[PDB]
Each structure stands twice: as C-alpha cells, then as structure tokens.
C-alpha cells in the first residue's frame, strides 16, 4: 500500500461522508489526433505526456480551497527534494499568497511516519537548495515545522483533521 | 476563438497579474497502449476519454474555493442542457454545499455574449428535466439571473470582475 | 409530542409575538364525494392525497423568505433519503435559486434530536442517490454541517433562533 | 378564463420560465379518519373543510416573500369588501409588518379591469368598514391607489412585471 493508495481511499472516504471534497488531478495529456466512429467511443490515436504545472491533489472544505503534493521516501533520516518540482513550487507559493490551504503529505515508508507540512516550509527548502544548500530536509526539521498524521482506517490517512487544528 | 483558448488567456492573465489562481483541469484519459520511437517522445497511441466527476475549472481567489463549468452553444435562443453531465452538476450540488463559490460560464458563440450564471440556477433547471421539464435555458432566464461578461483583451473575457460583484 | 405539532405550537408563538409570520401548508386533497346531513356541516366523505408539488412550511421573517420541510425519523444513525420527495427537492433547488432561505428540520425523534439543515446540503445528498450513494444521510453530517435546534417551551422549538445566527 | 382560472396559469408560466415561484394555498380541510389499505391509496373516509386563516397565494421572488389574495366582482362600479375576511386581513397585516410583499388582485370580471391594489389601501378600507364605513371601495378610488394589469398572452396576467415596477 503505497501514500497514493492511501490517499484515493482517504479522499473517497471524505466525499462520502461528506467531509470534504478533495479529488487527484488526472494524469496531464496533450491529445493530437483522436477519431470519432459513429456509435461507438472517441478514440485517442495520438497523444502525449505533458508537464503537470500543478500539484496532483486539490478541493474544498468549509469554504477554502485546499492543495496538496503528496510523496514517500525510503530514505530514513531526510525527506529529499528530487520529488520536487520548481512549477509544483511555483503554484504553491502563487497559492498561499491568495489564501489558499496549501501542504505536502511526506511520507518515511520504512518508519511508518507520515507528516503534514505547510507549502511555506517547503518553498524555503526548496528556495534554499536553488541557492544551492542542502537537497534533502532533515526528518527533526519535518516533525518540528510539521505535523504527525495518525494512520488508521476510515479514515487510512486524517489529514483533514490536522487541518482543522491547524488552518481553522 | 473559442471559450476555452479564451479562457486560458483569461486564467494566464490572473495568475501573471497576481489576481486570482485558476487552472483548467486535465480530461481525464484511460491509456490503453504506449509506443517508444526511433528517437523522440513517448507516444499514446490508443487511449479512452474516462466521464469526468468534476468541472472543469477550479483555483482560489481572495481565500475562496472557486470552481466553474464553461460552455458554449450555437444555439441563439436558448442554451441546451445536455451540455452538462450528470457527473458534473452533482459536483457543483457538493461544492455549493462546502461553502465554495460555483458558477457556469455560458456563451452563444453566434451572438458573441458570455454569461456567469451561479450554480443554484444550473442545479434547478438541469435537475427540472426529469418532469419533462425544459432540455434549455431560455435565454431570458440567463439574462434575467445571470450576469453579463464583458469580453475584450487583457483578459479576454473578465469574469473576476462579475465574481467580485456577486460573491462579495 | 409530533414534530408537527411542535411546530404547530412554535409558529403560533412566533406570530403571537411578532417575530415571524410562518404557516404549515395544508395537504393537497383530490375531493370525490361530499355528504350534505341534517343540523351538521357538510362531510367529505371520500377523498385522496395528492402528491405535494412543495415542501409543507414557508412564511417572511426580517424581510426574506423562509421555506422548510420538516421530517422525523425513528432511525437511531441516519436520516433516511425516501422521507423526501422529489417534487419537494425540486420545490427547494427553486426557492434557493429564487434568493430564498431554505432548510431542511429533522428530528431523531427516539434521540429526542433536533436539527436544522441547510437545503443545500440535503439537494446534495438526495441527488447523490442516483448513481448509487447511500440511502441515508448520517447523523455526523448532519452533526458537521446542520445545527442543533433547542428544544423547550415558548416556543416549543426555536428554530429562528438558529435562523438568526445562520442567514443573518 | 376566471381570476382563478388566469392565475393558475401565470402562476405556472413564471415556475416553468424561472420568473418566480408562486402557488395557491391548497384547500384547507380537517382531516379526521384515513384508511390505508394494503397496496392501494389511502383513502380519507371523514374530512371537514375549514376555515383559511391565510390568503390564498404566496412564494417568492427576487428573494422577497410574495402574498396575495385574488378576487372578483360582478359589480361595476365600486369592490365589494364583503369578499375579504377579518382573518386574511390581520394575516396581511403581519406579512406587511415583517418585511413581506402583501397586495390584492381585484378584477371586474364585467369590465375586464383587472387591479393590483397594495395591501396598505386594502387593511386601510377594511378597518374603515369595521368602524362602520363603507361596506365597498368604490372603482375610481382602486383605479387611483391601484396599478392596472392588462390581459396578455404569455402570461395572461403579468403580474409581476406591475411587482416589479412598485416594488422593485
Ligand atoms: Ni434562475
Ligand atoms: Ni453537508
């Protein structure tokens, strides 16, 4: 069970019960050639992989607009910034900067932690590594400007009630 | 052009302008077969359209969800219903309920004119059709309960400026 | 007592006292037969239901227009769906899209719970129903999202009071 | 083509235009024994009408609450306000009182002058009677205080468009 997995149950979950409304951005395509036969389905013939220029989850609950990046590592001691991407970055600060609730899911898959932190901690790491500082955030810097997210089931992953705390 | 390359210029503007940050989302996409060629790009070359359960387009403005659904007829005299699927007017039901800002951005692309009409009035005249009901929205509903965007350059089309008028 | 009754009581009290003008539907009633006896008034003697084309409550209140449906169930976990019609779910996407005040009250009558629940989110959750969402709403939706209702004497329940604080 | 008759299908027309929704009060009638038979309707077997404590139409518009009462008259020459009584009156006056938008449509169903008559000259003649005055307003004061509704096509009595003007 991989942080994606548990976050599509997570996020169905949510909607379901009403809690929120939360949805993965789909995978970015750019379609070329597509044909139409008469009653049957459109079919893409000629398409390509694009640059996402977003973070991959987003939604609303009461009323804000919420973004998110979600990323594991096996890496025991730092969460690395190679995940990142500058756009992903970019959005994110374009984001907070217009009231928006805006974090990364950091997950350490072989300690079973899993965090929340706010788009601002992150934009300063990764602001850093461009002036050419460390490429990886220390894991006590993750749990001391971030937020431990307790693992269960219904739902696998409660960010939201992290958020509540935090945001509200 | 059409509302969509309209729109993206439009949502470009926003964003460069440090006024709003709204992102078309990707159409959904089930890819079936991949190919790897002589020296360029990977290449799609058999893919499905999947039924979208969201609208179309969705950001923050002023620390506000903001989601909204644009499209455009030929017709000159009414706006046919069956230019929104079931998928995503159960969207914007839940969106409105999260307390989040939703609209239609309607244009008669024949009579060059371009309206935001609120959620709440999409929800009941989609929903009336099951009674019969109308399979349109007269033109007059739309001007007598929507709001006129005035379209021209930088942006193309300015609806923040009618959100601003209604929502705030 | 009946959730009608006690309603019956609290808009009484409301208009004694000027604070709402608020009045209970009659049933819609088909009439096939009349008696005509002696000293007595005329009886129906044979007559059908209607099926209702609007919820039950409306009336002013500080100038809008306030609309309701109001339901009680024996269930101890979740509101069930079936107690609204469609003519009525139709009747509230209308009068919210018309600028009206519109909520649902329910009561757990076994709990001795009662709520008020926007009509936004009870057209939400009834709609979802098509596609194969539950058949119910649970109460910790309506515990999130509706508002609890005081219940006592003068008036039996105070639902403008959560008006109040809700719409204005 | 009734007063009753005119307004059932404007009040249908506007619902089915999205203009306002308005309906008439369904009868008021006590309703004292039902059968439910097995897989069958439910018959009502002992029922009484009673009296309306309300007037006869209301809902909304524009996000005001709407409450009329329509009658007519084969006199020629003043209203008879023998039609009215003491209860839809003091109704009248509390919808007044709280913000609601409160009138009469009287015609003279031998003249084809169909009126709009604001409920303040209609409580303001009823109290009058009731000191022992004039039992009828006389045509030419309705003609002064109130705002003519000519018969049309779609819909036959464009009442609205006169709320509008007065109200709006
Ligand atoms: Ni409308
Ligand atoms: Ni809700």
Request: charged share 25%.
């Given at each position: 069970?991989?942080?994606?997995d548990d976050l599509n149950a997570t996020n169905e979950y949510y909607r379901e019960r009403g809690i929120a409304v939360i949805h993965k951005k789909p995978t970015?395509?750019?379609?070329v050639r597509v044909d139409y036969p008469k009653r049957?389905?459109?079919?893409?013939?000629?398409?390509?992989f694009r640059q996402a220029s977003t973070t991959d989850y987003n939604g609303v609950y009461r009323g804000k607009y919420i973004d998110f990046?979600?990323?594991?590592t096996k890496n025991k001691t730092a969460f690395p910034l190679k995940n990142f991407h500058a756009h992903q970055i970019r959005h994110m600060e374009q984001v907070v900067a217009h009231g928006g609730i805006c974090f990364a899911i950091l997950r350490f898959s072989l300690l079973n932690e899993t965090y929340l932190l706010d788009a601002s901690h992150?934009?300063?790491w990764w602001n850093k590594?461009?002036?050419?500082?460390?490429?990886?955030?220390p894991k006590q810097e993750i749990?001391?400007?971030g937020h431990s997210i307790p693992?269960?089931?219904?739902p696998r992953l409660d960010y939201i009630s992290v958020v509540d705390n935090v945001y509200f």
């Open positions: 069970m991989t942080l994606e970015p395509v750019q379609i049957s389905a459109a079919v893409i013939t000629e398409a390509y990046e979600a990323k594991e992150l934009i300063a590594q461009e002036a050419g500082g460390r490429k990886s955030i749990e001391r400007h693992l269960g089931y219904q």
